[PDB]
């Protein structure tokens, strides 16, 4: 009976463990715990995530510093063929000698795991070559990542305002950002690639000493400022390159032009820079769009205002979306999440087919454990995006302040919203499941024929518009030429965005009936996943079974029995429920690539083609083919090259399974036997007097819906982690 | 008494067992355990302080 760790009092007291568990897992929920004032909160998140950026550089520093005493470059640049370039050195006392088996990799002594993380191709990927040239890495990033803490404090301390009001503008900021930040953040990048990196790519080297002496050119920047611009692009490259040494390397910065390369895939070095340049006007022209107290341009209300495309004669309001989104801070952190969420996959689905990188994809392990750490996440977001926009509705949000008014109206006409959502799923449900059992009843019925498969136009058709090239068509009014495009031609799309059909690494792979299902079963994912998040959100404020359900909106998990019987009916426990389908879409989707890719690489393609079609033999081959290798790294007659992975893969099946307790157990049974199991000591010798500071308990009634999950998840996400790698590494592909 | 225990437990069941070393038979690691043990033991005598000499 002591007073103890503070912000809360409610927490600060119960002896029972809930005091710790809970202690950690409020820390972050600033609004409305003991301390908090709208001036506290804001700043109390500001010097928080200045504690951010900060931790992202102690990560990055070491990323570059468990490289360059050991684990190659000065062998991986020399010229790097799909063997096993290194991150770091493993050091565990538990190891056997059988450690001598890799757990050691050709050149280096230390046994290490070597890198699946993307970089080695990007540190190299622009310049940064040289093994006597680099230990730089931390030195900078870190003589940076401490400054990252310095404002943290400096701007902490009142003297120099941490500043409360200041946090609500917009206009000024974002009138600053999408110019100051992004624009010049590009530009400056456009800067770097071009003076110091492209020269390295064709390259011969920059040497540390001279910035002025190094010129791209002989007669120098040249009119340029003068616009010709054009003629950079004459004889920029010469495709048959010998990359990073010239000989035909050529020097006119920048292009559209020439090659997909058998040596490199990816994206001509210049172009990632006119682009980085090119966009850096639009954002700079964009930045400078709203006010900063000079008297030009725009005020963020009064374009929303009475503005409005439809109705204008409809009867739906615009009024103050701006102080309800400004005033919310959750609306904020949830249009933040998504955008990032939608683009985290646009990142990661473009990063393949369009990798920017020397010697990647066709490196093609690391191309398949990097599409997904950006598919996991990205899915992992979205949920949280949808989850801070059902907290806006309860903590913030103002029914009189909002009304008639389009965000409202969303609540109002909501019963429909979940229905014309649930109608999509149920349809997208049984109809994908007719097609896949039927497809599996047929087979093993031994009529394969009388299989039902749609070869699914709609994509193939997109990608005529683009092309090429598989067997023609005219397609009436294109016709495979005659009408060509005519307005456009030799300029722009050239040889580029012409791999065409191209099994090895096309961009576009040639889609059939196997893809007309997964593609309808990724679609049944984000739909179901969102009928529950849309719903989860819509009535966090709550409904009939609960009218009330508020002022804790979010996590009040459980309610008494009676009424109908009431349960996981907090907007958190629908978020809680949501995260299973974000772990089921972001599984069908990822699952898909790989099988495809795999087969594509010593590849039949065919095999996915007949073996996408039906459900069994999605196990049998894939899933059943190709665990092959990993499962014995143990195999009784001694241990082979991968052991981390397979042990992780079973670590994978345990963490998962052991979810279930949490999940089919429900505090009641656990607490009660702890009532008998805390009669032991109190009763049994040499165990006695002896006092807990915290009273034994069984975990609260929200807590374990989490923990099974945050448990269900690792297992699951640590199994595919270990699965794909433990199989795209041997191969065969 | 609890002392000379924790020998054959980690000198006859030791990690790569039945030792040929001068050390074990052994103090070794076990002497290390009485240290971890003995202070895991102390920061429990911060449950009671109640502090005197009588």
């Amino acid at each position: 009976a002591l007073r103890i760790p503070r912000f809360s009092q409610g927490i600060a007291q119960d002896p029972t463990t809930r005091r710790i568990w809970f202690g950690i897992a409020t820390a972050h929920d600033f609004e409305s715990h003991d301390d908090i004032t709208e001036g506290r909160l804001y700043q109390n998140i500001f010097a928080s995530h200045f504690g951010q950026l900060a931790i992202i550089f102690l990560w990055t520093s070491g990323n570059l510093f468990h490289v360059a005493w050991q684990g190659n470059f000065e062998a991986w640049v020399q010229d790097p063929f799909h063997v096993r370039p290194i991150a770091h050195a493993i050091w565990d006392p538990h190891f056997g000698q059988p450690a001598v088996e890799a757990f050691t990799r050709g050149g280096a002594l230390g046994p290490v795991n070597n890198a699946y993380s993307g970089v080695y191709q990007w540190w190299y990927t622009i310049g940064l070559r040289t093994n006597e040239d680099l230990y730089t890495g931390a030195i900078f990033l870190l003589f940076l990542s401490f400054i990252s803490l310095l404002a943290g404090w400096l701007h902490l301390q009142p003297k120099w305002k941490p500043s409360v009001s200041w946090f609500k503008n917009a206009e000024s900021r974002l009138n600053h950002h999408l110019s100051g930040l992004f624009g010049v953040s590009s530009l400056a990048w456009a800067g770097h690639l071009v003076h110091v990196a492209i020269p390295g790519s064709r390259g011969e080297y920059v040497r540390w000493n001279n910035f002025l002496d190094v010129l791209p050119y002989p007669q120098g920047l040249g009119p340029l400022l003068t616009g010709q611009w054009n003629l950079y692009a004459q004889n920029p490259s010469s495709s048959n390159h010998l990359f990073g040494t010239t000989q035909g390397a050529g020097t006119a910065i920048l292009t559209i032009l020439g090659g997909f390369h058998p040596q490199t895939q990816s994206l001509w070095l210049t172009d990632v820079a006119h682009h980085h340049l090119a966009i850096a006007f639009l954002f700079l022209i964009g930045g400078l769009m709203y006010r900063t107290n000079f008297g030009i341009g725009h005020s963020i209300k009064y374009i929303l205002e009475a503005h409005i495309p439809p109705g204008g004669r409809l009867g739906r309001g615009h009024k103050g979306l701006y102080d309800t989104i400004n005033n919310s801070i959750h609306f904020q952190l949830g249009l933040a999440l998504a955008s990032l969420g939608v683009i985290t996959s646009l990142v990661a689905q473009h990063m393949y087919s369009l990798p920017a990188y020397a010697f990647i994809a066709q490196d093609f392990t690391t191309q398949a454990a990097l599409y997904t750490h950006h598919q996991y996440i990205a899915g992992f977001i979205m949920t949280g995006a949808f989850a801070h926009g059902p907290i806006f509705f309860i903590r913030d949000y103002n029914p009189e302040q909002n009304a008639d008014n389009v965000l409202a109206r969303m609540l109002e006409h909501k019963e429909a919203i979940i229905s014309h959502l649930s109608w999509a799923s149920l349809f997208l449900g049984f109809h994908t499941l007719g097609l896949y059992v039927h497809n599996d009843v047929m087979l093993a019925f031994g009529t394969p024929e009388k299989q039902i498969l749609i070869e699914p136009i709609f994509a193939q058709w997109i990608q005529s518009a683009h092309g090429k090239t598989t067997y023609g068509f005219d397609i009436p009014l294109s016709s495979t030429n005659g009408p060509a495009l005519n307005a456009g031609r030799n300029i722009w799309l050239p040889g580029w965005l012409n791999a065409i059909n191209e099994n090895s690494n096309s961009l576009f792979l040639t889609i059939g009936p196997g893809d007309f299902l997964v593609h309808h079963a990724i679609a049944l994912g984000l739909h179901t996943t969102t009928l529950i998040l849309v719903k989860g959100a819509l009535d966090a404020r709550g409904s009939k079974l609960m009218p009330d359900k508020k002022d804790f909106g979010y996590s009040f998990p459980c309610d008494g029995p009676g009424r109908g019987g009431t349960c996981d009916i907090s907007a958190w426990d629908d978020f809680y429920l949501a995260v299973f389908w974000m772990l089921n879409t972001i599984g069908w989707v990822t699952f898909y690539w790989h099988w495809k890719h795999i087969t594509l690489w010593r590849g039949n393609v065919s095999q996915f083609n007949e073996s996408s079609t039906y459900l069994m033999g999605w196990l049998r081959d894939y899933l059943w083919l190709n665990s092959s290798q990993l499962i014995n790294g143990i195999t009784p007659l001694v241990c082979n090259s991968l052991s981390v992975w397979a042990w992780m893969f079973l670590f994978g099946h345990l963490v998962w399974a052991t979810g279930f307790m949490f999940l089919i157990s429900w505090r009641g049974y656990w607490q009660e036997l702890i009532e008998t199991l805390a009669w032991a000591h109190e009763r049994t010798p040499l165990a006695n007097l002896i006092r807990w500071r915290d009273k034994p308990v069984a975990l609260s009634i929200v807590q374990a819906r989490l923990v099974g999950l945050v448990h269900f998840s690792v297992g699951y996400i640590f199994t595919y982690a270990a699965f794909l790698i433990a199989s795209t590494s041997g191969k065969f592909g | 008494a609890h002392g000379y225990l924790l020998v054959g437990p980690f000198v006859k069941a030791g990690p790569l067992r039945n030792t040929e070393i001068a050390g074990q038979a052994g103090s070794l690691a076990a002497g290390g355990l009485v240290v971890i043990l003995s202070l895991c033991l102390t920061i429990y005598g911060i449950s009671s302080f109640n502090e005197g000499a009588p």
């Binding site: 002591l2 760790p5 710790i20 202690g23 050091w91 565990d92 500071r693 915290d694 | 971890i36 202070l39 920061i43 911060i46 449950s47």
Partner: peptide, 30 residues
Amino acid sequence: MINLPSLFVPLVGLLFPAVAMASLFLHVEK
């Protein structure tokens, strides 16, 4: 002397934990 860089796994993975599991039993008391 020859071959000896083994301290940044106990100081961290072993001893640093000792500190906090001790120390941070400040959550109980201090």
